[PDB]
Coordinates of C-alpha atoms in Angstrom, one line a residue:
Chain A
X2 CA -26.4 -33.6 -36.5
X3 CA -30.1 -34.6 -36.3
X4 CA -29.7 -37.2 -39.1
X5 CA -27.1 -39.0 -36.9
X6 CA -29.3 -39.8 -34.0
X7 CA -32.3 -40.3 -36.3
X8 CA -30.3 -43.1 -38.0
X9 CA -29.0 -44.3 -34.6
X10 CA -32.5 -44.5 -33.1
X11 CA -34.0 -46.2 -36.1
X12 CA -31.2 -48.8 -36.1
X13 CA -31.7 -49.3 -32.4
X14 CA -35.5 -49.7 -32.9
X15 CA -34.9 -52.4 -35.5
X16 CA -32.2 -54.0 -33.4
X17 CA -34.5 -54.3 -30.4
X18 CA -37.3 -55.5 -32.6
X19 CA -35.5 -58.5 -34.1
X20 CA -33.5 -60.0 -31.2
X21 CA -30.3 -58.2 -30.4
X22 CA -31.1 -55.5 -27.9
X23 CA -28.5 -56.3 -25.3
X24 CA -29.9 -55.9 -21.7
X25 CA -27.1 -57.1 -19.5
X26 CA -23.6 -58.2 -20.5
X27 CA -21.3 -60.0 -18.0
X28 CA -17.8 -61.2 -18.4
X29 CA -16.5 -63.1 -15.4
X30 CA -16.5 -60.5 -12.6
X31 CA -17.4 -57.6 -14.8
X32 CA -21.2 -57.2 -15.4
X33 CA -23.4 -54.3 -16.5
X34 CA -27.1 -54.0 -17.2
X35 CA -28.5 -51.3 -19.5
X36 CA -32.0 -50.1 -18.7
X37 CA -34.6 -51.1 -21.2
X38 CA -37.5 -49.0 -22.5
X39 CA -40.7 -50.1 -24.1
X40 CA -41.2 -50.1 -27.9
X41 CA -44.1 -47.7 -28.1
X42 CA -42.2 -44.8 -26.6
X43 CA -39.3 -45.5 -28.9
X44 CA -41.6 -45.3 -31.9
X45 CA -43.0 -41.9 -30.6
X46 CA -39.5 -40.6 -30.1
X47 CA -38.6 -41.7 -33.6
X48 CA -41.6 -40.0 -35.1
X49 CA -41.2 -36.8 -33.2
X50 CA -37.5 -36.4 -33.8
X51 CA -38.1 -37.3 -37.5
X52 CA -40.7 -34.6 -38.0
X53 CA -38.6 -32.2 -36.1
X54 CA -35.9 -33.0 -38.7
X55 CA -36.6 -31.4 -42.0
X56 CA -37.5 -34.8 -43.5
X57 CA -40.1 -35.1 -46.2
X58 CA -43.9 -34.9 -45.9
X59 CA -45.4 -37.6 -43.7
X60 CA -48.5 -36.0 -42.2
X61 CA -51.3 -34.3 -44.2
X62 CA -53.8 -31.7 -43.1
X63 CA -56.9 -33.7 -42.0
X64 CA -59.2 -34.8 -44.9
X65 CA -61.8 -32.9 -46.9
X66 CA -65.2 -34.2 -48.0
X67 CA -66.9 -33.6 -51.3
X68 CA -70.0 -35.0 -52.8
Chain B
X24 CA -94.3 -61.1 -61.8
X25 CA -91.4 -60.9 -59.4
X26 CA -93.0 -62.0 -56.1
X27 CA -94.5 -65.2 -57.4
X28 CA -91.2 -66.8 -58.6
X29 CA -88.5 -67.0 -56.0
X30 CA -88.5 -64.0 -53.7
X31 CA -85.9 -61.5 -52.6
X32 CA -82.3 -62.9 -52.4
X33 CA -83.5 -66.5 -52.4
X34 CA -85.8 -65.8 -49.5
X35 CA -88.8 -68.1 -49.9
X36 CA -87.1 -70.4 -52.4
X37 CA -88.4 -73.4 -50.5
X38 CA -92.0 -72.2 -50.2
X39 CA -93.7 -74.2 -52.9
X40 CA -97.3 -75.0 -52.0
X41 CA -99.0 -77.8 -53.8
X42 CA -101.7 -76.1 -55.9
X43 CA -104.8 -78.3 -55.7
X44 CA -108.5 -78.1 -55.2
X45 CA -109.9 -77.4 -51.7
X46 CA -111.1 -81.0 -51.5
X47 CA -107.5 -82.2 -51.9
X48 CA -106.4 -79.8 -49.2
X49 CA -109.3 -80.6 -46.8
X50 CA -110.3 -84.3 -47.0
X51 CA -106.9 -86.0 -46.1
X52 CA -106.9 -84.8 -42.5
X53 CA -110.4 -83.3 -42.3
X54 CA -111.3 -85.4 -39.2
Chain C
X2 CA -32.3 -51.5 -48.3
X3 CA -35.7 -52.2 -46.7
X4 CA -36.2 -55.5 -48.4
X5 CA -33.6 -57.3 -46.4
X6 CA -34.9 -55.5 -43.3
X7 CA -38.3 -57.1 -44.1
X8 CA -36.6 -60.5 -44.5
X9 CA -34.7 -60.3 -41.2
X10 CA -37.8 -59.1 -39.3
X11 CA -40.0 -61.8 -40.8
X12 CA -37.4 -64.4 -39.9
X13 CA -37.0 -63.2 -36.4
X14 CA -40.8 -63.3 -36.1
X15 CA -40.8 -66.9 -37.2
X16 CA -38.1 -68.0 -34.8
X17 CA -39.8 -66.2 -31.9
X18 CA -43.0 -68.0 -32.9
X19 CA -41.8 -71.6 -33.1
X20 CA -39.0 -72.1 -30.6
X21 CA -35.8 -70.3 -31.7
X22 CA -35.5 -66.8 -30.2
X23 CA -32.8 -66.7 -27.6
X24 CA -33.2 -64.7 -24.4
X25 CA -30.0 -65.6 -22.5
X26 CA -26.7 -67.3 -23.3
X27 CA -24.0 -68.3 -20.8
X28 CA -20.5 -69.8 -21.1
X29 CA -19.6 -70.1 -17.4
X30 CA -18.5 -66.5 -17.0
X31 CA -19.4 -65.2 -20.5
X32 CA -23.2 -64.6 -20.4
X33 CA -25.4 -62.1 -22.0
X34 CA -29.2 -61.5 -22.3
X35 CA -31.4 -59.6 -24.7
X36 CA -34.7 -57.7 -24.1
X37 CA -37.7 -59.6 -25.3
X38 CA -40.4 -57.8 -27.4
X39 CA -44.0 -58.9 -27.5
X40 CA -45.4 -60.6 -30.6
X41 CA -48.0 -57.9 -31.2
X42 CA -45.4 -55.2 -31.7
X43 CA -43.5 -57.6 -33.9
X44 CA -46.4 -58.0 -36.3
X45 CA -47.2 -54.3 -36.2
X46 CA -43.6 -53.5 -37.1
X47 CA -43.7 -56.1 -39.9
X48 CA -46.9 -54.7 -41.3
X49 CA -45.7 -51.1 -41.1
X50 CA -42.5 -51.5 -42.9
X51 CA -44.1 -54.1 -45.2
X52 CA -46.7 -51.6 -46.5
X53 CA -44.1 -48.7 -46.4
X54 CA -41.7 -50.6 -48.7
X55 CA -42.1 -51.0 -52.5
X56 CA -43.7 -54.5 -52.3
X57 CA -47.1 -54.9 -53.8
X58 CA -50.6 -54.3 -52.4
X59 CA -51.6 -56.3 -49.4
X60 CA -54.7 -54.3 -48.2
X61 CA -57.3 -52.5 -50.3
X62 CA -59.6 -49.7 -49.3
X63 CA -63.0 -49.7 -47.7
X64 CA -65.9 -51.7 -49.1
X65 CA -68.7 -50.7 -51.4
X66 CA -72.3 -51.6 -51.1
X67 CA -74.9 -52.2 -53.8
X68 CA -78.3 -53.7 -54.3
Chain D
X2 CA -41.5 -72.5 -49.3
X3 CA -44.5 -71.5 -47.2
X4 CA -45.5 -75.1 -46.6
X5 CA -42.1 -75.6 -44.9
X6 CA -42.6 -73.2 -42.0
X7 CA -46.3 -74.0 -42.0
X8 CA -45.4 -77.6 -41.1
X9 CA -42.7 -76.4 -38.8
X10 CA -45.0 -74.1 -36.8
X11 CA -47.8 -76.8 -36.7
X12 CA -45.2 -79.2 -35.3
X13 CA -44.1 -76.6 -32.8
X14 CA -47.7 -76.0 -31.8
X15 CA -48.2 -79.7 -31.1
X16 CA -44.9 -80.0 -29.4
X17 CA -45.7 -77.1 -27.0
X18 CA -49.2 -78.6 -26.5
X19 CA -48.1 -82.0 -25.2
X20 CA -45.0 -81.5 -23.1
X21 CA -41.9 -80.8 -25.2
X22 CA -41.4 -77.1 -25.7
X23 CA -38.0 -76.6 -24.1
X24 CA -37.6 -73.2 -22.4
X25 CA -34.1 -73.4 -20.9
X26 CA -31.4 -76.0 -21.4
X27 CA -28.3 -76.1 -19.3
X28 CA -25.2 -78.2 -19.1
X29 CA -22.2 -77.4 -16.9
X30 CA -22.1 -73.6 -17.3
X31 CA -23.5 -73.7 -20.9
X32 CA -27.0 -72.5 -20.5
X33 CA -29.4 -71.1 -23.1
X34 CA -33.0 -69.9 -22.5
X35 CA -35.6 -69.5 -25.2
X36 CA -38.4 -67.0 -24.9
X37 CA -41.9 -68.5 -24.9
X38 CA -45.1 -67.4 -26.5
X39 CA -48.7 -67.9 -25.5
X40 CA -50.5 -70.7 -27.4
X41 CA -53.2 -68.3 -28.7
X42 CA -50.8 -66.2 -30.7
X43 CA -49.2 -69.4 -32.2
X44 CA -52.7 -70.5 -33.1
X45 CA -53.5 -67.3 -34.9
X46 CA -50.1 -67.5 -36.6
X47 CA -51.0 -71.0 -37.9
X48 CA -54.4 -69.5 -39.0
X49 CA -53.4 -66.6 -41.2
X50 CA -50.2 -68.1 -42.4
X51 CA -52.0 -71.2 -43.7
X52 CA -54.6 -68.8 -45.2
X53 CA -51.8 -66.9 -47.0
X54 CA -50.4 -70.0 -48.5
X55 CA -52.3 -72.0 -51.1
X56 CA -53.8 -74.3 -48.5
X57 CA -57.4 -75.4 -49.2
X58 CA -60.7 -73.8 -48.3
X59 CA -61.4 -73.4 -44.6
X60 CA -63.5 -70.3 -44.5
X61 CA -66.9 -69.5 -46.0
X62 CA -68.6 -66.2 -46.8
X63 CA -71.1 -65.5 -44.0
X64 CA -74.3 -67.6 -44.1
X65 CA -77.6 -67.0 -45.9
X66 CA -81.0 -67.1 -44.3
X67 CA -84.1 -68.5 -46.0
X68 CA -87.5 -69.8 -45.0
Chain E
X2 CA -25.9 -22.8 -16.3
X3 CA -29.1 -24.1 -17.9
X4 CA -27.9 -24.5 -21.5
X5 CA -25.5 -27.3 -20.5
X6 CA -28.4 -28.6 -18.4
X7 CA -30.3 -28.8 -21.7
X8 CA -27.4 -30.6 -23.4
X9 CA -26.9 -33.1 -20.5
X10 CA -30.6 -33.9 -20.2
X11 CA -31.1 -34.4 -24.0
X12 CA -28.0 -36.6 -24.2
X13 CA -29.3 -38.7 -21.3
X14 CA -32.7 -38.9 -23.1
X15 CA -31.0 -40.2 -26.3
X16 CA -28.8 -42.6 -24.4
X17 CA -31.7 -44.1 -22.5
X18 CA -33.7 -44.3 -25.7
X19 CA -31.2 -46.3 -27.8
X20 CA -29.2 -48.4 -25.5
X21 CA -26.8 -46.3 -23.6
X22 CA -28.2 -45.7 -20.1
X23 CA -26.6 -47.9 -17.4
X24 CA -28.8 -49.3 -14.7
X25 CA -26.0 -50.8 -12.7
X26 CA -22.3 -51.5 -13.1
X27 CA -20.2 -54.1 -11.4
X28 CA -16.5 -54.7 -11.3
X29 CA -15.4 -57.7 -9.2
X30 CA -16.4 -56.7 -5.6
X31 CA -17.5 -53.2 -6.5
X32 CA -21.0 -52.6 -7.8
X33 CA -23.3 -49.6 -7.9
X34 CA -26.9 -49.3 -9.3
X35 CA -28.7 -46.1 -10.1
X36 CA -32.4 -45.4 -9.7
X37 CA -34.0 -45.5 -13.2
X38 CA -36.5 -42.8 -14.1
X39 CA -39.2 -43.5 -16.6
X40 CA -39.4 -41.9 -20.1
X41 CA -42.5 -39.6 -19.7
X42 CA -41.3 -37.9 -16.6
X43 CA -37.9 -37.3 -18.3
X44 CA -39.7 -35.7 -21.3
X45 CA -41.7 -33.4 -19.0
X46 CA -38.5 -32.4 -17.3
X47 CA -36.9 -31.7 -20.7
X48 CA -39.9 -29.5 -21.8
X49 CA -40.2 -27.7 -18.5
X50 CA -36.5 -26.9 -18.3
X51 CA -36.2 -25.9 -21.9
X52 CA -39.1 -23.4 -21.9
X53 CA -37.6 -21.7 -18.8
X54 CA -34.5 -21.1 -20.9
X55 CA -34.0 -18.2 -23.2
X56 CA -33.8 -20.4 -26.3
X57 CA -36.4 -19.8 -28.9
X58 CA -40.1 -20.7 -28.7
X59 CA -41.3 -24.2 -29.4
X60 CA -45.0 -24.0 -28.5
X61 CA -47.4 -21.2 -29.3
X62 CA -50.8 -20.0 -28.2
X63 CA -54.3 -21.4 -28.9
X64 CA -55.7 -21.4 -32.4
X65 CA -58.6 -19.2 -33.5
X66 CA -61.2 -19.7 -36.2
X67 CA -62.5 -17.7 -39.2
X68 CA -64.9 -18.4 -42.0
Chain F
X2 CA -51.4 -89.4 -38.9
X3 CA -54.0 -87.6 -36.8
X4 CA -55.2 -90.6 -34.9
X5 CA -51.9 -91.1 -33.0
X6 CA -51.8 -87.4 -32.7
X7 CA -55.1 -87.6 -30.9
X8 CA -53.7 -90.4 -28.7
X9 CA -50.6 -88.5 -27.8
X10 CA -52.5 -85.3 -27.0
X11 CA -55.1 -87.2 -24.9
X12 CA -52.3 -89.0 -23.0
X13 CA -50.6 -85.7 -22.3
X14 CA -53.8 -84.3 -21.0
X15 CA -54.2 -87.3 -18.7
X16 CA -50.7 -87.0 -17.3
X17 CA -51.2 -83.3 -16.8
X18 CA -54.4 -83.8 -14.9
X19 CA -53.3 -86.4 -12.4
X20 CA -49.6 -86.0 -11.6
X21 CA -47.4 -87.0 -14.5
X22 CA -46.5 -83.8 -16.5
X23 CA -42.9 -82.8 -15.8
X24 CA -41.9 -79.2 -15.9
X25 CA -38.2 -79.4 -15.3
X26 CA -35.6 -82.2 -14.9
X27 CA -32.1 -81.9 -13.5
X28 CA -29.1 -84.1 -13.0
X29 CA -26.2 -82.3 -11.2
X30 CA -25.4 -80.1 -14.2
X31 CA -27.7 -81.1 -17.0
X32 CA -31.1 -79.6 -16.6
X33 CA -34.0 -78.8 -18.9
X34 CA -37.1 -76.6 -18.5
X35 CA -40.4 -77.1 -20.3
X36 CA -43.0 -74.4 -21.0
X37 CA -46.2 -75.4 -19.2
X38 CA -49.5 -74.8 -21.0
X39 CA -52.7 -74.4 -19.1
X40 CA -55.6 -76.9 -19.1
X41 CA -58.2 -74.8 -20.8
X42 CA -56.3 -74.3 -24.0
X43 CA -55.2 -77.9 -24.1
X44 CA -58.8 -79.2 -23.9
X45 CA -59.7 -76.7 -26.7
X46 CA -56.9 -78.1 -28.8
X47 CA -58.1 -81.6 -28.0
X48 CA -61.6 -80.8 -29.1
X49 CA -60.5 -79.0 -32.3
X50 CA -58.2 -81.6 -33.6
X51 CA -60.7 -84.3 -32.5
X52 CA -63.6 -82.9 -34.5
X53 CA -61.3 -82.1 -37.4
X54 CA -60.0 -85.7 -37.8
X55 CA -62.1 -88.7 -38.8
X56 CA -63.4 -89.1 -35.3
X57 CA -67.1 -89.7 -35.3
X58 CA -70.0 -87.5 -34.1
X59 CA -69.5 -85.9 -30.7
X60 CA -71.4 -82.7 -30.9
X61 CA -74.7 -82.4 -32.8
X62 CA -76.7 -79.4 -34.1
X63 CA -79.0 -77.1 -32.2
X64 CA -82.0 -78.3 -30.3
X65 CA -85.5 -78.2 -31.8
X66 CA -88.7 -77.2 -30.0
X67 CA -92.2 -78.6 -30.3
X68 CA -95.5 -78.7 -28.4
Chain G
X2 CA -59.8 -98.5 -20.2
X3 CA -62.1 -95.8 -18.9
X4 CA -62.3 -97.5 -15.5
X5 CA -58.5 -97.5 -15.2
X6 CA -57.8 -93.8 -15.6
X7 CA -61.2 -93.0 -14.0
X8 CA -60.0 -94.7 -10.8
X9 CA -56.5 -93.1 -11.3
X10 CA -57.9 -89.6 -11.6
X11 CA -60.2 -90.2 -8.6
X12 CA -57.2 -91.3 -6.5
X13 CA -55.2 -88.4 -7.7
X14 CA -58.0 -86.0 -6.6
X15 CA -58.0 -87.7 -3.2
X16 CA -54.3 -87.6 -2.4
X17 CA -53.9 -84.1 -3.9
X18 CA -56.8 -83.1 -1.6
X19 CA -55.3 -84.4 1.6
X20 CA -51.5 -84.0 1.4
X21 CA -49.9 -86.3 -1.0
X22 CA -49.7 -84.5 -4.4
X23 CA -45.9 -84.4 -4.8
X24 CA -44.9 -81.1 -6.6
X25 CA -41.1 -81.5 -6.7
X26 CA -38.9 -84.4 -5.6
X27 CA -35.2 -84.0 -5.2
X28 CA -32.5 -86.4 -4.2
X29 CA -29.1 -84.8 -4.1
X30 CA -28.2 -83.9 -7.7
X31 CA -31.4 -85.3 -9.3
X32 CA -34.5 -83.1 -9.0
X33 CA -37.8 -83.0 -10.9
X34 CA -40.8 -80.8 -10.5
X35 CA -44.1 -82.1 -11.9
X36 CA -46.5 -79.4 -12.9
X37 CA -49.5 -78.7 -10.7
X38 CA -53.1 -78.0 -11.7
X39 CA -56.0 -76.6 -9.7
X40 CA -58.6 -78.8 -8.0
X41 CA -61.6 -77.3 -9.8
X42 CA -60.6 -78.3 -13.3
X43 CA -59.6 -81.7 -12.0
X44 CA -63.1 -82.1 -10.6
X45 CA -64.7 -81.1 -13.9
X46 CA -62.4 -83.5 -15.7
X47 CA -63.5 -86.3 -13.3
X48 CA -67.2 -85.4 -13.9
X49 CA -67.0 -85.3 -17.6
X50 CA -64.9 -88.5 -17.9
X51 CA -67.1 -90.5 -15.6
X52 CA -70.3 -89.3 -17.4
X53 CA -68.7 -90.3 -20.7
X54 CA -68.1 -93.7 -19.1
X55 CA -71.1 -96.0 -19.0
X56 CA -71.3 -95.7 -15.3
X57 CA -74.7 -95.3 -13.6
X58 CA -77.1 -92.4 -13.3
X59 CA -75.6 -89.2 -11.9
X60 CA -77.8 -86.5 -13.5
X61 CA -81.5 -85.9 -14.0
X62 CA -83.5 -84.0 -16.6
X63 CA -84.4 -80.6 -15.3
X64 CA -87.3 -80.6 -12.9
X65 CA -91.1 -80.5 -13.4
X66 CA -93.6 -78.4 -11.5
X67 CA -97.1 -79.2 -10.4
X68 CA -99.8 -78.1 -8.0
Chain H
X2 CA -63.8 -97.5 1.0
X3 CA -65.8 -94.3 1.5
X4 CA -65.7 -94.3 5.3
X5 CA -62.0 -94.2 5.6
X6 CA -62.0 -91.6 2.8
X7 CA -64.1 -89.4 5.1
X8 CA -61.9 -90.2 8.1
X9 CA -58.7 -89.2 6.2
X10 CA -60.3 -86.1 4.8
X11 CA -61.5 -85.0 8.3
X12 CA -58.0 -85.7 9.7
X13 CA -56.2 -83.7 6.9
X14 CA -58.6 -80.9 7.5
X15 CA -57.8 -80.9 11.2
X16 CA -54.0 -80.9 10.6
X17 CA -54.3 -78.2 8.0
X18 CA -56.3 -76.0 10.4
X19 CA -54.0 -75.9 13.4
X20 CA -50.4 -76.5 12.4
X21 CA -49.9 -80.0 11.3
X22 CA -50.1 -80.0 7.5
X23 CA -46.6 -80.1 6.0
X24 CA -45.8 -78.2 2.9
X25 CA -42.3 -79.6 2.4
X26 CA -39.6 -81.6 4.1
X27 CA -35.8 -81.4 3.6
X28 CA -33.2 -83.9 4.6
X29 CA -29.9 -82.4 3.5
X30 CA -29.9 -84.0 0.2
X31 CA -33.4 -85.3 -0.2
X32 CA -36.3 -82.8 -0.1
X33 CA -39.9 -83.0 -1.3
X34 CA -42.8 -80.5 -1.4
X35 CA -46.5 -81.1 -1.8
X36 CA -49.0 -78.8 -3.5
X37 CA -51.0 -76.9 -0.9
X38 CA -54.8 -76.8 -1.5
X39 CA -56.9 -74.0 -0.2
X40 CA -59.2 -74.7 2.8
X41 CA -62.4 -73.8 0.9
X42 CA -62.0 -76.6 -1.7
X43 CA -61.2 -79.1 1.0
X44 CA -64.4 -78.1 2.9
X45 CA -66.5 -78.5 -0.3
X46 CA -64.8 -81.9 -0.9
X47 CA -65.5 -83.1 2.6
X48 CA -69.1 -81.9 2.4
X49 CA -69.7 -83.5 -1.0
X50 CA -68.4 -86.9 -0.1
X51 CA -70.0 -86.7 3.3
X52 CA -73.4 -86.2 1.7
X53 CA -72.6 -88.8 -0.9
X54 CA -71.8 -91.6 1.5
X55 CA -74.2 -93.6 3.7
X56 CA -73.9 -91.5 6.8
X57 CA -77.0 -89.9 8.2
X58 CA -78.9 -86.8 7.3
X59 CA -77.0 -83.5 7.7
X60 CA -79.0 -81.0 5.6
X61 CA -82.7 -81.1 5.0
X62 CA -85.0 -79.5 2.4
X63 CA -86.2 -75.9 2.1
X64 CA -88.0 -74.2 4.9
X65 CA -91.8 -73.8 4.7
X66 CA -93.9 -71.0 6.0
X67 CA -97.2 -70.8 7.9
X68 CA -99.2 -68.3 9.9
Chain I
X2 CA -63.0 -86.8 20.5
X3 CA -64.6 -83.6 19.4
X4 CA -64.2 -81.7 22.7
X5 CA -60.4 -82.1 23.1
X6 CA -59.9 -81.4 19.4
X7 CA -61.9 -78.2 19.8
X8 CA -59.7 -77.3 22.7
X9 CA -56.6 -78.0 20.6
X10 CA -58.0 -75.8 17.8
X11 CA -58.7 -73.0 20.2
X12 CA -55.1 -73.3 21.6
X13 CA -53.7 -73.2 18.0
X14 CA -55.8 -70.1 17.3
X15 CA -54.4 -68.3 20.3
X16 CA -50.9 -69.4 19.5
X17 CA -51.2 -68.0 16.0
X18 CA -52.8 -64.9 17.5
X19 CA -49.9 -64.0 19.7
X20 CA -46.6 -65.1 18.1
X21 CA -46.2 -68.8 18.2
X22 CA -47.6 -70.3 15.0
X23 CA -44.4 -71.8 13.7
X24 CA -44.2 -71.6 9.9
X25 CA -40.9 -73.3 9.1
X26 CA -38.4 -74.9 11.4
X27 CA -34.8 -75.7 10.3
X28 CA -31.8 -77.5 11.7
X29 CA -28.5 -78.2 10.0
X30 CA -29.8 -79.7 6.8
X31 CA -33.1 -80.7 8.3
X32 CA -36.0 -78.3 7.7
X33 CA -39.8 -78.5 7.3
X34 CA -42.4 -75.9 6.6
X35 CA -46.0 -76.1 7.6
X36 CA -48.7 -74.6 5.4
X37 CA -50.4 -71.5 6.9
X38 CA -54.1 -70.7 6.9
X39 CA -55.7 -67.3 7.3
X40 CA -57.2 -66.3 10.6
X41 CA -60.8 -65.9 9.4
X42 CA -61.2 -69.5 8.2
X43 CA -59.8 -70.8 11.4
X44 CA -62.1 -68.5 13.4
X45 CA -65.2 -69.7 11.6
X46 CA -64.0 -73.3 11.9
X47 CA -63.7 -72.9 15.7
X48 CA -67.2 -71.2 15.5
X49 CA -69.3 -73.8 13.8
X50 CA -67.5 -76.8 15.2
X51 CA -68.0 -75.5 18.7
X52 CA -71.7 -74.9 17.7
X53 CA -72.0 -78.5 16.4
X54 CA -70.9 -80.0 19.7
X55 CA -73.3 -80.0 22.6
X56 CA -71.6 -77.2 24.6
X57 CA -73.7 -74.3 25.7
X58 CA -75.3 -72.2 23.0
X59 CA -74.1 -68.9 21.6
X60 CA -76.8 -68.2 19.1
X61 CA -80.4 -67.1 19.4
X62 CA -83.5 -67.1 17.2
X63 CA -83.5 -63.8 15.4
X64 CA -85.2 -61.0 17.4
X65 CA -88.7 -59.7 18.2
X66 CA -90.2 -56.3 18.1
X67 CA -92.9 -54.9 20.4
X68 CA -94.3 -51.5 21.3
Chain J
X2 CA -57.6 -68.8 32.5
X3 CA -59.1 -66.0 30.4
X4 CA -57.5 -63.1 32.3
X5 CA -53.9 -64.2 31.6
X6 CA -55.1 -64.8 28.1
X7 CA -56.2 -61.2 27.9
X8 CA -52.9 -60.1 29.4
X9 CA -50.8 -62.1 26.9
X10 CA -52.8 -60.9 23.9
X11 CA -52.7 -57.3 24.9
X12 CA -48.9 -57.6 25.5
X13 CA -48.4 -59.3 22.1
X14 CA -50.4 -56.4 20.5
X15 CA -48.1 -53.9 22.3
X16 CA -44.9 -55.6 21.1
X17 CA -46.2 -56.0 17.6
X18 CA -47.1 -52.3 17.5
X19 CA -43.8 -50.8 18.5
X20 CA -40.9 -53.1 17.5
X21 CA -40.9 -56.3 19.5
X22 CA -42.7 -58.9 17.4
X23 CA -40.1 -61.3 16.0
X24 CA -41.0 -62.7 12.6
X25 CA -38.1 -65.1 12.6
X26 CA -35.0 -65.9 14.6
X27 CA -31.9 -67.6 13.2
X28 CA -28.8 -68.9 15.0
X29 CA -26.3 -70.5 12.7
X30 CA -27.9 -73.7 11.4
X31 CA -31.1 -73.3 13.4
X32 CA -33.7 -70.9 12.2
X33 CA -37.5 -70.6 12.8
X34 CA -40.1 -68.2 11.5
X35 CA -43.6 -67.6 12.8
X36 CA -46.7 -66.7 10.7
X37 CA -47.3 -62.9 11.0
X38 CA -50.9 -62.1 11.7
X39 CA -52.1 -58.7 10.7
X40 CA -53.1 -56.0 13.2
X41 CA -56.8 -55.5 12.5
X42 CA -57.7 -59.1 13.2
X43 CA -55.6 -58.9 16.3
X44 CA -57.7 -56.0 17.6
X45 CA -60.9 -57.8 16.7
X46 CA -59.7 -60.9 18.7
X47 CA -58.7 -58.6 21.6
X48 CA -62.1 -57.0 21.6
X49 CA -64.0 -60.3 21.3
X50 CA -62.3 -62.1 24.1
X51 CA -62.1 -58.9 26.1
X52 CA -65.9 -58.5 26.1
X53 CA -66.5 -62.3 26.4
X54 CA -64.7 -62.4 29.8
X55 CA -66.1 -61.2 33.1
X56 CA -64.3 -57.8 33.0
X57 CA -66.4 -54.7 33.1
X58 CA -68.4 -52.9 30.5
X59 CA -66.4 -51.2 27.6
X60 CA -69.3 -50.6 25.2
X61 CA -72.9 -49.7 25.8
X62 CA -76.1 -50.0 23.8
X63 CA -77.4 -47.7 21.0
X64 CA -78.3 -44.0 21.8
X65 CA -81.5 -42.2 22.6
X66 CA -82.8 -38.9 21.2
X67 CA -84.9 -36.3 22.9
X68 CA -86.0 -32.7 22.2

């Protein structure tokens, strides 16, 4: 089910990026605050869980040098 | 040549000395 | 479906820049807030999924040198 | 339509500069707070966004040296 | 009892990553908040408690060299 | 329309310096909050848009040196 | 009008210096909070603005040395 | 009006030192607060306008040396 | 009036030392708060203002060295 | 009246150390708070006015060295 939380985390990253990452929601008398992470660690999580998934080539073996 | 004309990358484009006899380059402010 | 993602992110960048990114709303018992992202990460996200998408070249490669 | 938000962001810069950038506005339980950005980032935004648009020359290629 | 430990810890990681970790919850007159751990320490916990399990290898030994 | 811009910015600087730059106002329910810029950036803005406009010489070139 | 706001800024420096710089004033229901600046930048503003005014000598040109 | 300026500054310094400088007052509906300045700036201010006024010598020139 | 003012400053220093330097005092609706200094500045103030008055010395001209 | 001053200061140190230095006291509608001095400056004050008074030696002068 790796594709599922891959898509979920990517959507959450975009959601937090634009404006809509809800932090606290409060109806009268019923409030709840979700903890918020940074953006960098979200990106690292996205990248790591993407490469762990059998998704296509994204990293190449260093770089050769020829004259 | 190449050094006489203008220089390297403009360089001494403004260095144009007034070719003249030594008298013309001495007498004005000789004193 | 990256192009509209680009459009939405660029918009949100514009509203954050000028005056129109909302942090909290409240309706006397119906209130909610969103986490705020720094502008640097916004421009990094914009650039990353701008180059990643199929839109044209924006940055070239190194710089030659000759006499 | 680049000139449009160019002018909008210039006006926003001036508006923040003098006194008028509203952060939070509240009226009888209807309160909305807008996030704020440092003036430096807005200045750089003006800079490269007006560079990107067809606005006139404002940068020159280094500076030569000659005797 | 460590496999379900893996599952719970990974699910908590994902929930905290996207949006779904609750810092505090308040019904009218009844509220509780939970201490919020960071991300890095949670990832070290994940790694340390998955290596101790019998599930397959994820990291290997140091790399040699040969001409 | 830069000259009255200069006048407005200079006036805003003057009110900021002495006592007359208002951060928030409130009347028993209707309140507004203004983002407060610092002094350094405001004087930089003053100098920049003062030299940019048709305002006369204020800063000259480098100082010569003779015996 | 350099004399007018020169004297105004001098008086502002004085009454901020002793005790009279009002920060926030509030009658029941109606409150405002003027922003506050440091004393150092106010002093620099006073100095620059009086030297720009055609007031008398306040500075000398370096200092010579002789045996 | 320099002499009473000196007198008021010396007073305000004395009240600030012991206990008698008031940061704010409140009257159950009408409250005000004044910006509090650090003691060091007040001492420099008093010293500067003390040396600037017509009162007698307080600090002399540099110290000579002799065998 | 310097001697009794010095006595008052010393008494205030002692009062702050033990427990009695009142910061804020509040009745029903009526409250004030007095700004608080550090202890070092008050100590040096006591020091050099006691020095400046004619009371008996506490300083001596450096120190000699003999065999 | 230095001896009772010593007694009061040593007391106040003792109460501050264990539990008995009241930072603020509030009856309904009548509260006061006292500025809380640190402990290091309290000990320095204790030592200073302890040695300044006529009570006996507590510290002696340097230290010799012999073979």
